[PDB]
């Protein structure tokens, strides 16, 4: 489920905030193995401020489909 950063079966503002905190390393860990995968929204291997921007823009619906 591309984007479900906290793995609760929804993609919402809660994911984006957790992600911001993860990328900062202000929370040490995402809740699961799938989570980490969900977090990499541009399927580019790394999880960082780009995912954050992408997720941010998908939530605003400026981007139609995620995985890109």
Q: Give CA–CA dist 36/64, Å, rounded.
A: 22
CA atoms within a 13 Å half-sphere pointing along the CA-CB vector of 2:
16
- Rounded Cα gap, residues 55 and 23, in angstroms: 13
Nearer CB in complex with other proteins: 13/32: 13
Q: Which one, 10 or 57, has the nearer CB to Ca ion?
A: 10
C-beta neighbour count of 25 within 10 angstroms: 8
Among 2, 3, 18, 35, binds other proteins (CB under 8 A): 18
> Is 32 a residue that touches other proteins (CB under 8 A)?
no
Q: Which parts of this chain interact with other proteins (CB under 8 A)? A: 6, 10, 12-14, 16-18, 20-21, 23-24, 26, 56, 59-62
């Amino acid at each position: 489920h591309m984007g479900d950063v906290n793995d609760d079966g929804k993609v919402n503002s809660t994911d984006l905030t957790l992600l911001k905190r993860y990328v900062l390393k202000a929370v040490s860990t995402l809740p699961s193995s799938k989570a980490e995968k969900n977090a990499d929204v541009n399927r580019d291997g790394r999880v960082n401020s780009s995912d954050v921007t992408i997720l941010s823009r998908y939530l605003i619906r400026v981007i139609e489909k995620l995985p890109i």
